[PDB]
């Protein structure tokens, strides 16, 4: 048994329809390997300033005969600084027709995120702490764990196919892998973190130069661009011809000529030999103003986001603590087998 779920290419992130409650209230929520909690926008939520947080569906707990209030406060803050707060609850969650009962979720009543988020990472990365660092509620079975426990999938694992930059939709498959959608063989890479879905990136090849790395990179579906440590990003930037711009008090972004030559590729080599080749088109991010961001940015965190992941077929295995990777093959052909 596998469960395929369509991913809507929404621009900065990828979202899916998921229903919640006895009355199956449909939500459109970001599919996020970079977080571990599923939360929905309450119908009576107050959105953050200038945020249209209710336009992708909302959840009315009082409409669901099966909703259970856990009474514990929920709070989460994401890498980009956006936040959500509400209360923990449990309800039935249905994903492409497959229902799991008593699934712990957060009913969010204030958020600066545009829509709900289905976090599908490790349970150890659940946002169960107050903003004092104190744990306020126990770690729990998140959606992938519950799919496994309730016999919907065999292994806590899922395959990610974001599809092409111009594609309308991709696919995530819980408990399965589509063998038609990559070239060569999947190569298993060791997850190197207790909390994050990170693997060892050995080197990056850009403009025919090799740049040795060797540290972990988070493979995050819920991050738009690619982020490297400042020093490493600067080496790549110099080669790429990107220029650093302070855009705010404590934020620096690389920009690049909108007309830069994007005919080449950037190659990512991983510890166990996985190899992903990314077209350089992925490193010119159109802003609205006739300026372009470079697709690589400096950060204390190393994150390979959507502009990388579109070019890989990835099988995340949270039981084995491996992520198996091969060069994507864009095709509607399908040959899915259970994992």
């Amino acid at each position: 048994d596998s469960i395929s779920l369509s991913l809507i290419n929404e621009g900065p992130s990828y979202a899916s329809k998921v229903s919640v409650g006895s009355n199956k209230q449909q939500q459109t929520v970001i599919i996020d390997t970079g977080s571990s909690d599923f939360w929905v926008v309450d119908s009576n939520a107050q959105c953050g300033k200038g945020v249209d947080c209710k336009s992708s569906g909302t959840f009315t707990p009082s409409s669901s005969s099966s909703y259970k209030n856990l009474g514990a406060a929920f709070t989460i803050r994401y890498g980009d600084g956006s936040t959500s707060q509400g209360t923990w609850g449990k309800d039935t969650v249905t994903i492409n027709g497959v229902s799991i009962t008593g699934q712990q979720i957060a009913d969010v009543t204030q958020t600066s995120v545009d829509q709900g988020i289905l976090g599908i990472g490790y349970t150890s990365n659940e946002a169960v702490y107050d903003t004092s660092g104190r744990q306020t509620t126990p770690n729990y079975d998140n959606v992938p764990v519950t799919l496994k426990k309730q016999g919907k999938i065999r292994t806590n694992a899922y395959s990610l196919y974001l599809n092409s930059p111009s594609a309308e939709t991709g696919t995530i498959i819980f408990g399965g892998v589509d063998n038609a959608k990559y070239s060569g063989k999947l190569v298993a890479e060791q997850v190197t973190s207790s909390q994050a879905l990170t693997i060892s990136l050995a080197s990056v090849n850009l403009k025919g130069s090799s740049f040795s790395f060797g540290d972990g990179a988070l493979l995050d579906s819920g991050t738009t661009l690619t982020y490297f440590p400042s020093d490493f990003a600067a080496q790549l930037a110099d080669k790429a011809g990107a220029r650093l711009v302070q855009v705010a008090r404590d934020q620096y972004l690389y920009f690049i000529d909108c007309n830069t030559d994007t005919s080449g590729t950037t190659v990512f080599n991983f510890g166990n030999g996985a190899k992903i080749t990314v077209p350089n088109t992925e490193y010119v991010y159109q802003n609205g103003d006739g300026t372009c961001l470079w697709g690589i940015q400096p950060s204390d965190d190393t994150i390979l986001g959507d502009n990388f992941l579109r070019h890989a077929y990835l099988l995340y295995n949270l039981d084995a603590n491996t992520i198996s990777i091969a060069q994507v093959k864009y095709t509607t052909d399908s040959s899915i087998s259970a994992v």
Binding site: S13, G34, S35, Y78, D80, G119, N125, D220, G222, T224
Partner: peptide, 6 residues
């Protein structure tokens, strides 16, 4: 863009 829990 966004960067999703670090």
């Amino acid at each position: 863009x966004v960067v999703x829990a670090x």
